[PDB]
Amino acid sequence: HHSYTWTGALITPCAAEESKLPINALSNSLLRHHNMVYATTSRSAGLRQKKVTFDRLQVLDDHYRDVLKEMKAKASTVKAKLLSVEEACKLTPPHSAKSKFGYGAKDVRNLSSKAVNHIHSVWKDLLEDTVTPIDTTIMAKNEVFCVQRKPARLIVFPDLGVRVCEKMALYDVVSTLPQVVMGSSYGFQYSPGQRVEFLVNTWKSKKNPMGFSYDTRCFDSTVTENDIRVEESIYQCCDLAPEARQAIKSLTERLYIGGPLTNSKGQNCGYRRCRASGVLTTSCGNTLTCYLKASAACRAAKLQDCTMLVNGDDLVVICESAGVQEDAASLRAFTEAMTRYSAPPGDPPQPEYDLELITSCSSNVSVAHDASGKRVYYLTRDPTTPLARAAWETARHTPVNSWLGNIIMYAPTLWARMILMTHFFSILLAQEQLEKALDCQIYGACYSIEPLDLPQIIERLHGLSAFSLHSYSPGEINRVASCLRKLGVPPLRVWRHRARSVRARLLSQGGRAATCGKYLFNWAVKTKLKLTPIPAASQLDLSGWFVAGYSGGDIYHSL
Ligand SMILES: CCc1ccc(/C=C2\SC(N[C@H](C(=O)O)c3ccc(F)cc3)=NC2=O)o1
């Protein structure tokens, strides 16, 4: 029951890979400790293969089946529809990996004949064949981090034609099934603000609150064939068209359960018997599986008034404390149950009695104050990785602008406002590209967003208070201060001086650019403005922004 079997062939890159942080004339204005930033490459692929390769053992008890039965009952109320080839094509990212059959992403979005014809042949084959493993490509992810160096993560994905087929049969399912089965526990249905709200209300709903995050060690690798088949049995509970049931069964048997691994050179690298990270059901499957195992584990551990929040492989549990020693015992029992379910922890879980100290989804709840001096809760995170990626994007253009996504998700934070907003708006001003739409990701989905709409986006998602937060917590202030010293980022006085310049320039620009200066940089000036609700700013269609997770799903949503 090994997660992977290897042949010995190496995981090759598709081109040259840079490990050192690229430097240009703008780098030093953001940070000076360039040696602290690096990017993972295929050169470390071997190290990752060792960590992700191991034998899995599963002991499934009654709690597990009782939870699965309840999950299935809820899934049976779901009615999903098949997506036409056209609709599926439109969900394909403009920069999605080209097919090895004579066409690319652009060809798919344009609904070219060759692309559409090939997609129809793949679909037909899925209906006719339900046993032949489908080929997948394995690549070493190139991600930017700050030294503490971690090995590159592994990405496994099927051909573009197959991906479009996954959308046709499962897009509607993975988009609606999760919330129905897990209810309020499904994390991707919440925007950052609503997530905070849910956590805070949950924490206050307990007499003596106790919470903990559970970090599964290489979750994808802990996912067994049983887990993948159980997920399928849940999808099959929905009301689906016969053709959709057939495709789902075929995709599960031939793709989700496992398959051969081919490198960028076309060589056989090995065989996968666990979760593929680059398929449409990756986020939905991991979420359902984590929720199932964790729910059963909560019962085995006999936790009191248990409330969970699950986002893919990320999990947070808040319950009623029964004392320090008792909680420590309940946690060990939880971890033992999870281990039996094939979900061992990377780092032993610890009980927390302070909400702000619980980190889930690489984030945590913190508190600040608005203009009225009223306490306001918001979502934050350690800014180390966001700033490292910002430094990289400062000297190199990339498919996804993490800085943009971070400003949107973390607009209320001290670091996003002082540094990210200031630094990038300065750059956009100098290049006169304020109106140039840029791609970023939100819950795994790719979006094309115009920087000039940030004020409206921020007010809608975080409220006007996001433009006037002050008096951040001691812990938050210290974490940010720590990051700035580690990377060598200029102090507040410097960013304030720069923000004043950026603000003045935006104001003169008038229109949306003026709104950006007024709201985004109101913290810069000494005599803050009243900050009245933004005028005509409610046109963007943000309805599908926080519906579900799509990490690795190759999903693109049009604004
Ligand atoms: C990292 C070191 C550091 C610098 C500044 C702080 C703490 C701060 S700054 C602050 N308010 C100011 C303000 O003018 O309202 C502020 C400054 C910068 C920003 F991007 C937002 C808000 N309230 C706090 O508690 O910590």
Which residues on adjacent β-strands are paired with residue 215?
314, 347
* CA-based nearest residue to 284, from 363, 180, 212, 198: 180
* CA-based nearest residue to 123, from 88, 161, 93, 159: 161
Residue where the block lists tokens 């990752």: 48
Residue 480, CB-side half-sphere exposure with 13 Å CA sphere: 20
Which residues on adjacent β-strands are paired with residue 209?
320
Would you say 260 and 135 are in contact if contact means Cβ atoms under 8 Å apart?
yes
- Here the tokens at position 361 are 């989804």
Secondary structure of residue 435 in the 3-state scheme: coil
- Here the tokens at position 304 are 């009191």
Cβ 479 under 6 angstroms from ligand 1: no
Residue type, 42: S
Would you say 141 and 42 are in contact if contact means Cβ atoms under 8 Å apart?
no
Residue type, 109: R
Cβ 333 under 6 angstroms from ligand 1: no
* CATH class of the domain defined by 183-223+281-361: alpha beta
In angstroms, the CA 68 to CA 235 distance is: 12
- Here the tokens at position 403 are 């800085």
Q: How was this structure determined?
A: X-ray
In angstroms, the CA 440 to CA 410 distance is: 14
State the DSSP H helix or E strand holding residue 153, giving kind and residue range, or none if neither.
Answer: none
Distance 405 CA to ligand 1 centre (A): 21
Distance 210 CA to ligand 1 centre (A): 30
In angstroms, the CA 278 to CA 229 distance is: 18
In angstroms, the CA 480 to CA 500 distance is: 21
Residue type, 519: Y
Secondary structure of residue 139 in the 3-state scheme: strand
* Atom from ligand 1 closest to the CA of residue 421: 20
Which residues on adjacent β-strands are paired with residue 442?
445
- Here the tokens at position 275 are 């979760």
In angstroms, the CA 160 to CA 92 distance is: 9
* CA-based nearest residue to 283, from 307, 309, 310, 258: 310
Would you say 350 and 185 are in contact if contact means Cβ atoms under 8 Å apart?
no
CB within 8 A of 14, min separation 6: which ones?
139, 264
In angstroms, the CA 202 to CA 188 distance is: 17
Distances from the Cα of 120 to the Cα of 100, 116, 127, 171, 276, angstroms: 16, 6, 11, 17, 23
In angstroms, the CA 112 to CA 102 distance is: 11
Which residues on adjacent β-strands are paired with residue 211?
318, 352
Pairing between strand 259-262 and 136-140? parallel
Distance 415 CA to ligand 1 centre (A): 9
Residue type, 385: T
- Here the tokens at position 366 are 């913190």
State the DSSP H helix or E strand holding residue 190, giving kind and residue range, or none if neither.
Answer: none
- Here the tokens at position 233 are 């049995």
In angstroms, the CA 492 to CA 409 distance is: 22
Would you say 437 and 449 are in contact if contact means Cβ atoms under 8 Å apart?
yes
Give the dihedral of Cα atoms 382, 383, 386, 387; nearest 10 deg: -150
Q: Give helix then strand counts, H and E, for the chain.
A: 21, 16
* CA-based nearest residue to 312, from 274, 263, 275: 275
Which residues on adjacent β-strands are paired with residue 145?
38
* CA-based nearest residue to 274, from 96, 443, 154: 154
Q: CA 99, 105, 106, 108 torsion: positive or negative?
A: positive
Neighbours of 113 (CB within 10 A): 10
* Atom from ligand 1 closest to the CA of residue 528: 14
* Residue ranges covered by each domain of the chain: 1-55+133-158+258-273, 56-132+159-182+224-257+274-280, 183-223+281-361, 362-559
Q: CA 133, 126, 93, 191 torsion: positive or negative?
A: negative
Cβ 472 under 6 angstroms from ligand 1: yes
Q: Report which protein residue has its CA nearest ligand 1's atom 20.
A: 418
- Here the tokens at position 314 are 């990320």
Cβ 492 under 6 angstroms from ligand 1: yes
Q: 376-388 burial by CB neighbour count: b if 16+ within 10 A, else e?
A: bbbbbbbbbbbbb
Question: Phi and psi dihedrals of 307, rounded to 5?
Answer: -130, 130
Q: What share of the chain is helix, strand, coil (3-state, %, to 5)?
A: 50, 15, 35
Neighbours of 455 (CB within 10 A): 24
∠ CA 278-280-282, nearest 5°, is 65
CB within 8 A of 105, min separation 6: which ones?
92, 93, 94, 95, 96, 97, 98, 160
DSSP conformational letter for 157: E
Q: Report which protein residue has its CA nearest ligand 1's atom 4.
A: 492
State the DSSP H helix or E strand holding residue 316, giving kind and residue range, or none if neither.
Answer: strand 314-320
Task: For 22-79, give the DSSP string.
Answer: P--TTHHHH-S-GGGEEE--GGGHHHHHHHH--B------HHHHHHHHHHHHHHTT-B
Would you say 43 and 11 are in contact if contact means Cβ atoms under 8 Å apart?
no
Looking at 243-306, which runs of residues are DSSP E strands? 259-262, 268-272
- Here the tokens at position 549 are 């997770």
Would you say 321 and 353 are in contact if contact means Cβ atoms under 8 Å apart?
yes
* CA-based nearest residue to 280, from 400, 156, 189: 156
Give the dihedral of Cα atoms 345, 336, 357, 381; nearest 10 deg: 30
In angstroms, the CA 160 to CA 104 distance is: 8
What's the distance, CA 211 to chain centroid?
22
Secondary structure of residue 281 in the 3-state scheme: coil
Cβ 477 under 6 angstroms from ligand 1: yes
In angstroms, the CA 415 to CA 296 distance is: 39
Would you say 9 and 263 are in contact if contact means Cβ atoms under 8 Å apart?
yes
Would you say 286 and 551 are in contact if contact means Cβ atoms under 8 Å apart?
no
In angstroms, the CA 300 to CA 325 distance is: 18
DSSP conformational letter for 184: G
Distances from the Cα of 277 to the Cα of 141, 208, 213, 307, 464, angstroms: 11, 38, 22, 27, 37
Q: Report which protein residue has its CA nearest ligand 1's atom 12.
A: 470
In angstroms, the CA 48 to CA 217 distance is: 12
In angstroms, the CA 162 to CA 297 distance is: 35
Distance 471 CA to ligand 1 centre (A): 7
In angstroms, the CA 287 to CA 270 distance is: 27
In angstroms, the CA 547 to CA 187 distance is: 9
Cβ 411 under 6 angstroms from ligand 1: no
In angstroms, the CA 430 to CA 480 distance is: 27
* Atom from ligand 1 closest to the CA of residue 495: 18
∠ CA 212-481-407, nearest 5°, is 75
Neighbours of 252 (CB within 10 A): 21
Distance 63 CA to ligand 1 centre (A): 48
In angstroms, the CA 23 to CA 25 distance is: 7
- Here the tokens at position 95 are 């920069």
Directed axis angle between helix 422-431 and helix 492-509, to 10°?
40
Task: For 196-212, give the DSSP string.
Answer: HHHHHHHHHTSSSEEEE
Exposure of 124 by Cβ count < 10 A (0-12 exposed, 13-18 middle, 19+ buried)? Answer: exposed
- Here the tokens at position 122 are 């793949």
Would you say 234 and 284 are in contact if contact means Cβ atoms under 8 Å apart?
no
Residue 92, CB-side half-sphere exposure with 13 Å CA sphere: 35
Task: For 497-533, give the DSSP string.
Answer: HHHHHHHHHHHHH-HHHHHHHHHHTTTTSSS----PP
In angstroms, the CA 341 to CA 293 distance is: 6
Cβ 355 under 6 angstroms from ligand 1: no
Task: For 346-412, give the DSSP string.
Answer: EE----BS-GGG--BTTBEEEEEE-TT--EEEEEE--SHHHHHHHHHHHHS--SS-HHHHHHHHHTT
Distance 16 CA to ligand 1 centre (A): 41
Would you say 343 and 222 are in contact if contact means Cβ atoms under 8 Å apart?
yes
Residue type, 537: A
Question: Phi and psi dihedrals of 469, rounded to 5?
Answer: -70, 140
In angstroms, the CA 433 to CA 421 distance is: 15
Q: Provide long-range contacts, Cβ within 8 A and 24+ apart, for 101-110.
A: 101/159, 101/160, 101/161, 103/160, 104/160, 105/160, 108/160, 108/164
